């Protein structure tokens, strides 16, 4: 839809809402369907948010919570996710906390104390699903908020967990409907990063949200570079080692393995070559598992985790710079969600799939449908021409996406689109007209036409289009006529002779005439043959004196966040996110009037984290032009 209705700033809350948006969160401009969804939520509407990873779903309910009487209750599937959000909120001086269960009864009761006072300073109250089900202690508190009209809304994060059709089904999410029974008056809000429409639909039916406002979005991952690479067996680990050290020596990443064993093996092989790799799966003791996620999330002695897909979903950080699938994913849907969680922080990240058909026989060893999905994954890997962004979205039936993306956004081009980045698409409607006219006048096979069009001495006819494509490759000439058959401008019918010998010849297609009228134009891209590709001059843009200083500055800025983290007892990225930091460095300014103009820089954060950051930026004061 298009929510023109929810786009207005005439609303009563708009004054207060923009105040928190600018001064508390530190943001400047709303992204797609953010203002619309926020407005709607603050009008008491039932909202259903569909946005890809890193879209900006948190703002869609966190901002409304800050500008509402009472507390918003957010259901999350994992305390890890909960902990990260609460850490983000308290870092912005937004009162919030959680009852996951590992909070001792003394602390737990103290929470119930603050909620009972009916003067709560707390806007967000995160909660786990089994807690509501198991603890009848929490319920009797919420009921009191309900009576005083202080239950703002029920936010259901990761809403795809209610569906058995989802990549992560959870039993307790089915029991969330009992929360609405006791509290019907309360606005409900569901968010998910699932692109699967079949799952998206089921969420609403299962959670039984009756005709909500649906805020959808393009599930294209704007900041992910999709790579498929040839998997020469027995040197996967070496290729991961080679790639990582070349592109991301000092950044975190994930390598997905099929088995608990391949995790252990992959981690070992990488380790003995000097890479800080660790294995991550359910086979680990609870002490080990906790130790892995401690080291990886905080970037303390671990760069890469070698995890099973099942277990890798259980933890996350926003600045994952690369995700590698060591084998062949079970499905395209699976692969998209797995590689999608990379680069949540919005910075460029890499998605590398190592492919061999050998893995198919491997993977081969409604289960009939399970085989179908596998082959669709194989089709994705084998397809080395069509833009990989389109291949993924086509699997979900997403409509609207412009195939111009990788060309307009070189920094995040897929490998397929990297091949053709230098080729120019031109209009050849003239030549097509000539061709259609030639065929219309005259029994020719496609190849016969190609020869004539090229100017071969093997050409039967020299009258019409002969030599018209004298500046075409035989490779391109053949591609053009191939294109014309596909685009229905030309057609092909079988001709049989003496003994069942079938020979195809070119005729006009239904879309031929519409070209002569001038209503249809065709665009053709001339490409090199595979055995004819010329190498490219590797030498890249030279660094400038200022560009050298932002790197060094950003480096120091990063450490300041790392230190501030341990001090304030918080993950280093819940201080300043990657984009905020990168932009601070790009300003090189110590002038607070310029810093506050950057996304993520707020008065509170620049007050309690400011001195250290401004200090570093002062050193480069004589470069701030």
């Amino acid at each position: 839809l298009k929510h023109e209705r929810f786009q207005s700033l005439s609303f009563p809350h708009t004054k207060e809402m923009m105040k928190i948006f600018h001064k508390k969160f530190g943001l400047h401009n709303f992204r797609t369907n953010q203002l619309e969804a926020i407005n709607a939520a603050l009008l008491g509407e039932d909202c259903f948010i569909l946005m890809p990873t890193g879209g900006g779903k948190s703002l869609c309910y966190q901002l409304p919570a800050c500008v509402s009487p009472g507390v918003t209750v957010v259901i999350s599937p994992l305390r890890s996710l909960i902990v990260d959000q609460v850490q983000k909120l308290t870092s912005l001086d937004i009162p919030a906390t959680y009852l996951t269960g590992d909070k001792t009864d003394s602390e737990a009761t103290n929470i119930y104390l603050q909620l009972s006072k009916k003067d709560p300073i707390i806007k967000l109250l995160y909660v786990t699903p089994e807690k509501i089900c198991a603890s009848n202690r929490l319920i009797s508190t919420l009921e009191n908020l309900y009576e005083r009209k202080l239950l703002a809304r029920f936010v259901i994060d990761e809403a795809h967990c209610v569906s058995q059709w989802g990549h992560d089904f959870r039993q307790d999410y089915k029991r969330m409907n009992m929360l609405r029974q006791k509290f019907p008056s309360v606005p409900v809000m569901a968010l998910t990063a699932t692109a699967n429409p079949r799952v998206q639909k089921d969420i609403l039916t299962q959670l039984k949200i009756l005709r909500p406002q649906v805020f959808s979005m393009s599930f294209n991952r704007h900041n992910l570079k999709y790579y498929v690479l040839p998997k020469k067996p027995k040197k996967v680990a070496f290729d991961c080692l080679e790639w990582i050290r070349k592109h991301h020596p000092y950044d975190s990443g994930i390598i997905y393995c099929l088995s608990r064993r391949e995790c252990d093996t992959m981690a070992d092989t990488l380790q003995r070559d000097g890479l800080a790799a660790l294995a991550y799966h359910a086979g680990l003791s609870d002490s080990a598992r906790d130790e892995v996620q401690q080291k990886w999330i905080n970037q303390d002695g671990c760069q890469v985790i070698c995890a099973t897909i099942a277990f890798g979903m259980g933890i996350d950080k926003p600045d994952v710079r690369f995700v590698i699938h060591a084998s062949l994913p079970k499905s395209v849907e699976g692969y998209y969600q797995e590689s999608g969680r990379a680069g949540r922080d919005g910075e460029i990240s890499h998605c590398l799939l190592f492919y061999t058909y050998h893995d198919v026989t491997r993977l081969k060893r409604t289960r009939e449908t399970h085989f179908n999905n596998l082959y669709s994954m194989v089709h994705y890997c084998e397809n080395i021409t069509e833009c990989r962004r389109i291949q993924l979205l086509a699997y979900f039936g997403e409509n609207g996406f412009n195939p111009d993306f990788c060309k307009k956004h070189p920094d995040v081009s897929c490998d397929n689109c990297c091949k053709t980045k230098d080729y120019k698409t031109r209009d050849v409607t003239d030549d097509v007209k000539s061709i259609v006219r030639f065929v219309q006048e005259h029994r020719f096979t496609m190849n016969m036409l190609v020869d004539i069009f090229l100017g071969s001495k093997s050409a039967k006819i020299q009258s019409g289009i002969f030599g018209k494509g004298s500046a075409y490759s035989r490779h391109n000439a053949e591609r053009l006529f191939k294109k014309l058959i596909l685009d229905k401008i030309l057609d092909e019918d079988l001709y049989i002779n003496a003994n069942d010998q079938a020979i195809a010849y070119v005729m006009l297609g239904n879309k031929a005439q519409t070209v002569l009228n001038g209503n249809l134009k065709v665009d053709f891209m001339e490409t090199e043959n595979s055995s004819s590709v010329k190498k490219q001059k590797a030498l890249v843009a030279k660094v400038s004196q200022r560009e050298e200083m932002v790197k060094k500055c950003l480096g120091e800025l990063t450490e300041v966040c790392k230190s501030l983290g341990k001090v304030f007892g918080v993950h280093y990225f819940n201080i300043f996110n990657t984009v905020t930091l990168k932009k601070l460095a790009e300003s090189l300014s110590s002038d607070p009037e310029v810093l506050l103009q950057i996304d993520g820089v707020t008065e509170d954060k620049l007050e309690k984290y400011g001195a250290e950051v401004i200090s570093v930026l002062q050193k480069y004061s004589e470069w701030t032009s």
Partner: nanobody
Amino acid sequence: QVQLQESGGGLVQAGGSLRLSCAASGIWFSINNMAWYRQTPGKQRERIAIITSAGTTNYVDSVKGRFTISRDDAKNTMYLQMNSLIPEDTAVYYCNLVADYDMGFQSFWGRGTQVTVSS
């Protein structure tokens, strides 16, 4: 001048699926169309699916919907994805390549492979 190597096929229970392959080899050659034939125990060869170099496909009734013929030019390979197999499909399956006009529209054949569908 042209060599056709067939792979895939064999014994399989009904309802199962098979994938036949046909790789084309030669120092140089042209392609007008490529077709799959099949020969039941007491019958002659029957063209069940055919594809042209441009991608235009064409099928017989008995296989329509179930069988999908396709070609990869970069690897000069031609497939026939056989779905929903039945004991009637039990036959020898030959690959076929028809060259274009630079050659005599020559027709090359593979040796044939057995697709046996047991109940």
